[PDB]
Amino acid sequence: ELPMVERQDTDSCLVYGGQQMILTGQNFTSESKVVFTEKTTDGQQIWEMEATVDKDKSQPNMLFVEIPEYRNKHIRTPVKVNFYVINGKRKRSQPQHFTYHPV
Amino acid sequence: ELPMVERQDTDSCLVYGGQQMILTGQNFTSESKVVFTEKTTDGQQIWEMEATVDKDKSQPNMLFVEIPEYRNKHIRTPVKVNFYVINGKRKRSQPQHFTYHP
Ligand SMILES: N[C@H]1CCOc2ccc(F)cc21
Numbered sequence: 001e002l003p004m005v006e007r008q009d010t011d012s013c014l015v016y017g018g019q020q021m022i023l024t025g026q027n028f029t030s031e032s033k034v035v036f037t038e039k040t041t042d043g044q045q046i047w048e049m050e051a052t053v054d055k056d057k058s059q060p061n062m063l064f065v066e067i068p069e070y071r072n073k074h075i076r077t078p079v080k081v082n083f084y085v086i087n088g089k090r091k092r093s094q095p096q097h098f099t100y101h102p103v
Numbered sequence: 104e105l106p107m108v109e110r111q112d113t114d115s116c117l118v119y120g121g122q123q124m125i126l127t128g129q130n131f132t133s134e135s136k137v138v139f140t141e142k143t144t145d146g147q148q149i150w151e152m153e154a155t156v157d158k159d160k161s162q163p164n165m166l167f168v169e170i171p172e173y174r175n176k177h178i179r180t181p182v183k184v185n186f187y188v189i190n191g192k193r194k195r196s197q198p199q200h201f202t203y204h205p
């Protein structure tokens with residue numbers, strides 16, 4: 001019943017974001033949300049940003065997602081972040097991995 | 104809820120193993136296990152090794168893990184392996200990536 005992500009077609013991009021990522025998986029709906037986050041090693045969440053889903057193109061096994069602009073556009077080394085797909089208030093997918101690179 | 108791995112502070116190490124890897128995530132418990140694996144491209148698992156967790160230091164969002172020694176310390180090129188966190192008999196995280204170097 002949870003959203004599931006089997007694959008993503010994009011693992012990185014420049015800090016501005018603003019490019020399409022395709023998620024292959026299961027149990028996506030027009031109410032699925034995609035949420036990018038980042039945590040410190042000790043687990044404090046220091047970033048959260050919802051990503052825009054293209055709901056016309058998306059299908060129950062295929063989500064089209066616009067990668068967010070990263071929290072700090074002035075980073076000087078690549079930064080590892082996560083994203084998950086969530087249905088409702090609690091049914092979230094496993095966390096996926098993504099990397100932003102400096103301009 | 105399944106174990107979830109959001110971060111690892113170590114992506115690789117030498118075949119000796121023994122250094123500490125911190126995993127950041129969710130739904131870890133004192134019974135969580137960390138299992139390293141290797142499989143061929145036809146998908147046959149050719150290595151399985153449980154990694155020792157420091158259960159005193161670990162928290163529900165942090166696992167302190169001793170990286171295992173790799174199965175063959177005489178390799179001459181790096182080897183890609185996976186690891187996962189498992190609670191109970193079958194509730195596992197998706198596979199994470201790791202590399203052993205010669
Ligand atoms: N285009 C609709 C119908 C097909 O199923 C989905 C799944 C996710 C989504 F965002 C939109 C849609």
Ligand SMILES: N[C@H]1CCOc2ccc(F)cc21
Nearest residue numbers: 131132133158159161162163
């Ligand atoms: N130190 C205990 C209590 C806090 O939660 C955890 C989580 C994982 C673990 F290995 C041990 C513990």
